[PDB]
């Protein structure tokens, strides 16, 4: 028996991430070493920040890393490996046996299906089909999984018997970015028409996107209502 | 469905030669003077054993790739490549599916461990078996979707890592001998590496063309131990 | 015995770089197998790569490379190094007797000094600055270059006896990146009102910088274009 | 003008760990499981041992190392050559740079390089350490000279320090992950027992020494596995 899901979930598992360190780093190029100990206040932070987001001197914003704990079916996880600057380490199953759980969209989800991602009039659906696609999935889900198990059972490598798992199948990894690697993500995967470049990605990397943005918020308040500020544009 | 066992790549367009390097190389010691056989054999195995990997780098190859989703996660990790791959979300995937053909060891089991490795051919014919059924009740799945309006990006959670892809993949020479020293399994490298059968094809191709591009490059690499410089 | 010029030089050595790569790396997106195969004529080039570019798609812009022999005073070989997506070799000080050749900047320059970059206020300058800097410029040069030769015939390694060598000494390279790296680099190496994002970039590595894109827009004139019609954004 | 020999590197920042190894390693075999249970220190050292032995490196970039570096401008553009890591330099565009310049001290002079990677290159002695300095104080007081003059003159900070040597001091910030910094070490330390010897010049070894050292009180763990097999980057 299966396992269907739908929640993807991302938790910081570590960091070390502030304001100061941006404030800090970009010191340096104009006070030199005055810049390690000087006496920087919140309004000087909020003053400099918002200016190096503006001139998109971006290169203070990399003295940092936050490291994320990131669940999510493969398909997703396909979408936040394509950005390079990151760290993965993902949990394989070419080596371990791989856990029924997969991914299915919520009712509520499938009401913003993107036909053509770009284009305004490939956007809508409605909540008879949430039903269809649960029936789709659970039958697919199934019969994949019992083949893995059969072929498992009959002592088949795990790096082929997994051949038959969907991409809906959920995986788990980390996922370390420093603050300018996580504000070009953030611009690229979510949709946000107030921004300077919108975006189209698929909603469940948005999920994804979003806590780590929620995360990443607490961390570096100043700069990330700068980053929204400035139309959401990486430095 | 179509089950294919192919995994293919060409070589589509490249600027890579063994002259390219030692020229770069050359600056250093000669400066503008920079821009025989036995000086390029001779410089390019001292830039491998000495592991200068930044004149390998001036170069470019791009390569076309055919292989099922599971191996285009292999090759993705390389994070120094440029890739541009088909997409589901935009398309309608073709209903092709990987199945590995005869001489596939079927029994690596944990990677690392030859202690795991092994097979038969009454495991072939489990396999096609299996996975075929798991695949047409998958691409049926998927089609029913689409048939009920369904958008693809949704469509397509159904459909198994072994549904082929294609892509264009580039690199440069120093990146490619790390990927070669990673994703071909040598018991004569210095660091013996266990990549999945399928990616190590890739790679293999890939050596195979690059090797005809810059023949003394690939020598050296191969003599001091498939050690990316 | 030195020598002082003014000439910041870049050469296009080799390249495998054109439009229709670009076209065929978007496509295979959309098309599959058969974006390799397809013909694509000028209009349906123009409207791909210029929709690309303003949607910040860029990864279809990296199936390229351009190597530059480039020969620069060493202050501005460091601007151009800090683009960390390109790959670079360059002339060795440890390893050769480094050449007597300094820069000063010309007397149409110095009209065009960044006192503090991106305050306009500081951008200025008289016609008998170009004396005063010749005068300062060379007395320091003809010191330094006659230390280092001392040091040499002393027997210091090469090395060491650099040290006594100003920031304007001449060094060569080779400078290799792709398009979508020379296009950040244009965007901020490149002083342009008309851009996006006016960045203020020392005259001596936009001098690089501007023949580096003159050698590009033969190469790829529909990128070219796409990329001013835009802002000079990269995508 | 002051000249100086000293090269410093201060750890002014960290989240680095063994711990964040074996985590990021764990996950792969014993998938969700590896964020939340039983840890052991020689089950830690096997592992991290076995890593760094078959190379697998990716587990060793979740963390990050922010040094605040002071060295002269020649041996930064040798740590600036590492496009892995994240910089920020103190501008002579927008600064007057200060008149400190460094000079080798007695004892580095007697060792010197080449022609550096042949061993019979390297050598030196005491009264070049005399030479070196006086001919030092002769180059760097006129450049400095010259400097303020055209400063004075109102020329551009970015054009007036066209004449200062790259024996000036500069000072930065430079973040790397463990991964990064490990391949740096490979090759700007010189190790006659490593895999691979390397002949850096010494002031960037100086700055490498340092940041080795602070390191390893971070991740005594990985920093003995990596000297254990021979100073190779996983
Ligand atoms: C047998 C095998 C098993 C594997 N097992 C797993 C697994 O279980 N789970 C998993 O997630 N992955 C696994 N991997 C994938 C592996 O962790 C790498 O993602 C992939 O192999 C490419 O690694 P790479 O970074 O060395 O090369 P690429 O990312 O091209 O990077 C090339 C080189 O670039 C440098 N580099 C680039 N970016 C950075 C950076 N940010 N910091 C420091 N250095 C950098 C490093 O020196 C690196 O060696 C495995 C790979 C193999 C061959
Ligand atoms: C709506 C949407 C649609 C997409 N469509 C497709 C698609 O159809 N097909 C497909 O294959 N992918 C697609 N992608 C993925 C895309 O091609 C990118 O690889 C991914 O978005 C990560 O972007 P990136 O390359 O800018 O950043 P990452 O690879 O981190 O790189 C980050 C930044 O680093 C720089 N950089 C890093 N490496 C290099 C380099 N080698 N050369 C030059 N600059 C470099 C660039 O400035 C880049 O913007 C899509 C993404 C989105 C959000
Ligand atoms: C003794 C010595 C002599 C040297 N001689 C010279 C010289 O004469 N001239 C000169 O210019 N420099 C010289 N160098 C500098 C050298 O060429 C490198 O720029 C510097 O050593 C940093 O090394 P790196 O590129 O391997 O590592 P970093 O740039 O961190 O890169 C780490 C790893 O990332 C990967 N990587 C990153 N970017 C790319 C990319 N675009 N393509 C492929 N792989 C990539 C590679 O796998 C690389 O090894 C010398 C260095 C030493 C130690
Ligand atoms: C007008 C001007 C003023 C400047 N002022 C200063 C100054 O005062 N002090 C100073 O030190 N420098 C200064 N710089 C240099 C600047 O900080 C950058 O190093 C330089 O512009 C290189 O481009 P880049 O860092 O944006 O990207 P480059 O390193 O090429 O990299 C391209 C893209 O790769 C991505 N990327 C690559 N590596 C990482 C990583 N490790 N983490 C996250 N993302 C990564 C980013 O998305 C980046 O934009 C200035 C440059 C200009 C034009
Ligand atoms: O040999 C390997 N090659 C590889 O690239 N991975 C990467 C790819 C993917 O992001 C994740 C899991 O891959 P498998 O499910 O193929 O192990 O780790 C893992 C192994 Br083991
Ligand atoms: O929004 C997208 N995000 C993404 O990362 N890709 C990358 C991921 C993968 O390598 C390939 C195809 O992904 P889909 O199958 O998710 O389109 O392109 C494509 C699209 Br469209
Ligand atoms: O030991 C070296 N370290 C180094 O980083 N380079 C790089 C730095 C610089 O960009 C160029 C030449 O510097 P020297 O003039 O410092 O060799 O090559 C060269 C040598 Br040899
Ligand atoms: O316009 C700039 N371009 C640049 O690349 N830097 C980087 C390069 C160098 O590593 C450091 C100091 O450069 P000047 O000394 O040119 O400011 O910051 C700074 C400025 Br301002």
Known sequence: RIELRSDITVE??????????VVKAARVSTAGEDANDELYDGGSTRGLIRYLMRSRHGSPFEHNSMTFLVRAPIFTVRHLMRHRT???????????????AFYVPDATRLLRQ?????????????????????????????????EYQRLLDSGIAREIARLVLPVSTYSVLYATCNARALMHFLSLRTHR???????HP???????????????????????EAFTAFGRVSP
């Not at 036909?115 to 199934?142: F, L, M, N």
């Open 12 to 21: 910081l598992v570590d960091s070390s991430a502030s304001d100061l360190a």
């Open 114 to 146: 993107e036909g053509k991602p770009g284009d305004y009039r490939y956007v809508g659906g409605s909540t008879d089909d949430h039903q269809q696609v649960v029936r789709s999935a659970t039958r697919a889900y199934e019969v994949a999984f019992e």
């Open 86 to 100: 990151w760290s993965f380490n993902e949990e394989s199953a070419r080596y371990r046996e791989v856990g029924a």
């Open 193 to 199: 028409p107030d921004a300077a470049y919108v975006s």
């Open 202 to 224: 698929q909603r469940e990397i948005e999920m994804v996107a979003e806590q780590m943005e929620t995360a990443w918020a607490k961390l570096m308040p100043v700069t990330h």
